[PDB]
Write a protein that binds this ligand. Structure first.
Ligand SMILES: Cc1cc2nc3c(=O)[nH]c(=O)nc-3n(C[C@H](O)[C@H](O)[C@H](O)COP(=O)(O)O)c2cc1C
Ligand SMILES: Cc1cc2nc3c(=O)[nH]c(=O)nc-3n(C[C@H](O)[C@H](O)[C@H](O)COP(=O)(O)O)c2cc1C
Ligand SMILES: Nc1ncnc2c1ncn2[C@@H]1O[C@H](COP(=O)(O)OP(=O)(O)O)[C@@H](O)[C@H]1O
Ligand SMILES: Nc1ncnc2c1ncn2[C@@H]1O[C@H](COP(=O)(O)OP(=O)(O)O)[C@@H](O)[C@H]1O
Ligand SMILES: Nc1ncnc2c1ncn2[C@@H]1O[C@H](COP(=O)(O)O)[C@@H](O)[C@H]1O
Ligand SMILES: Nc1ncnc2c1ncn2[C@@H]1O[C@H](COP(=O)(O)O)[C@@H](O)[C@H]1O
Lengths: 268, 270
């Protein structure tokens, strides 16, 4: 029994499907297999916002659920429905998908098809947080419009920026090379997970050059992060990206951060 | 600094103007301000093709460049050049526009006037594309011939139909403004759904004019939500079908080419 799809971000509508995968599992005595497609057709277009995380990262969550097998978009973009079943669904007798799920050169095959190929399709009806069908798209935008405080209602958690370092002080994050989405330009209140389990707060600014840069000033930290990797949770969108008195502006933020922080701490 | 004119479509011409503004201003630690004249004289004359987008849409885009302010046409329409200057340009150093920029009753207002009155007018050379001065007027003719493929070249992006929604086909209410109509026929389009998803779809214009799109791989009520539709390719002439089925056939023959062209649009990135 397997659920197919991209699963980018692995949102709440995603987790729905995965769990139902566990159900149809037990009551079938079968084992579970997630089939995560590398990229959506869109990815290969200019106006594509971006992925919410790297595939490597996505197969970290998808994994913590079932056994994930990544399907390469190049390798399957021309396979026909029949071609697909044969090369990827043999032996399997049931899939878990959503009301939309299509597949095969020209979306040639719906669930009906798979049914007529001797396979059971358990369609999970759409999940919707506040009037809209959760989706990577929908989250892909709030990220663009700086609406971070609005993401947990869809992502099941805070949006995250993560990468290798270098390449005030501020740490420069290299989110890798995949075509990832970028946040509205600006200053953000962030939660930093450092090595050794450390979770320090910080402020992160995002600016141009075309390109977008990610720099965080981690509060109360004074060590070397040059080579290290980091995972930052974007909690709040503080202020917009501005204009030699900048060293004076950041303090608005820092002194501000310290305050938003202490806000929670008190509200036991 | 300040820029003036209608700005219907905000095409590459319009952009060179707004970008020059955005610069002439940094060179001065000055501030931008766009004055968009709601309409153009033709708008109220026999046979006006209509605008490309609603004034609201238009302000929307201009907004990303700088503070925008709309001026009723009917108002400044009568003002004399000094009048106009006395009401809007006061204490404003620079004014970015391009050749052929005029203002005031009977167009007596021009760049020389602003200059003689202490304001620095920075004309911009007309932007040519394939031996043509980019113009809101041009683009309109294209839309009208269904030559939507040639549009991005001048317009700087894909022509776009929009409105409120009022196999199944969504009925777009473009609005009550006077907008330009496409050649009646069938088009491949790219839909921008309320939620945020972008599905391909196929639109048909026929006949005022009626616009209805059948979005590919999609199901859900949209009655009441807005849709922006990038018009990507012209496929066929909206013809008469004396038998319902001949239509069902055609419509399906349309959705077929749709699907393939789409495969083309992607197998063309590697
Ligand atoms: C909390 C924080 C807030 C910042 N806010 C801004 C800002 O609003 N505008 C800006 O231009 N730079 C800001 N910066 C700094 C730039 O990111 C900094 O100049 C960096 O070196 C990269 O910018 P650069 O490529 O222009 O040199 C901020 C830095 C920090 C740590
Ligand atoms: C892709 C697509 C192509 C269409 N092509 C035509 C066409 O060539 N001729 C036609 O009369 N109707 C066509 N239709 C249907 C009309 O748009 C339909 O009659 C609709 O109800 C509006 O037309 P009406 O106002 O005359 O009823 C097409 C519909 C779709 C979705
Ligand atoms: N509190 C801190 N926040 C961000 N980086 C720090 C901090 N403390 C030490 N560093 C280190 O210093 C580097 C930033 O160096 P520097 O060149 O001085 O500034 P910039 O951020 O402009 O590149 C980081 O790569 C990191 O290893
Ligand atoms: N894939 C789709 N394409 C077009 N409309 C759809 C689709 N799915 C659902 N709809 C909805 O169906 C309605 C259009 O219904 P229909 O009566 O069949 O078309 P029309 O009256 O324009 O010929 C709209 O409210 C629209 O939001
Ligand atoms: N919001 C949602 N509600 C229900 N099912 C969903 C939702 N979002 C995704 N799915 C299903 O989960 C799988 C997700 O893959 P993808 O759409 O590529 O992210 C597909 O089989 C979808 O139908
Ligand atoms: N193709 C072009 N190249 C350079 N400037 C242009 C072009 N088309 C229009 N402009 C300028 O941009 C402004 C556009 O206003 P309007 O002509 O009303 O749309 C006027 O001040 C024109 O001089």
């Amino acid at each position: 029994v397997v659920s197919i799809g991209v699963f980018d971000g692995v949102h709440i509508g995603h987790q729905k499907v995965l769990r139902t995968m566990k159900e149809i599992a037990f009551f079938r005595k079968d084992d579970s297999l997630i089939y995560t497609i590398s990229y959506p057709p869109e990815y290969f277009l200019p106006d594509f916002p971006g992925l919410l995380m790297t595939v490597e990262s996505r197969v970290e969550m998808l994994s913590r659920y079932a056994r994930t097998v990544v399907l390469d978009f190049f390798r399957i973009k021309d396979l026909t429905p029949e071609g697909f079943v044969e090369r990827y669904l043999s032996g399997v007798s049931a899939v878990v998908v959503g009301r939309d799920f299509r597949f095969g050169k020209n979306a040639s095959g719906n669930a009906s098809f798979l049914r007529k190929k001797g396979v059971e399709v358990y369609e999970i009806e759409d999940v919707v947080v506040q009037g809209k069908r959760v989706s990577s798209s929908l989250i892909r935008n709030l990220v663009q419009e700086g609406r971070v405080e609005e993401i947990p209602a869809y992502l099941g958690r805070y949006f995250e920026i993560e990468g290798i370092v270098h390449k005030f002080p501020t740490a420069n994050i290299d989110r890798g090379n995949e075509k990832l989405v970028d946040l509205k330009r600006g200053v953000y209140l962030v939660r930093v997970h450092l090595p050794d389990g450390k979770k320090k707060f910080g402020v992160m600014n995002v600016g141009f050059r075309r390109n977008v840069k990610y720099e965080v000033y981690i509060l109360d930290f004074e060590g070397d992060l040059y080579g290290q990797r980091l995972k930052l949770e974007v909690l709040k969108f503080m202020r917009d990206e501005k204009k030699e008195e900048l060293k004076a502006a950041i303090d608005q933020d820092v002194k501000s951060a310290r305050n938003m922080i202490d806000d929670i701490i008190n509200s036991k």
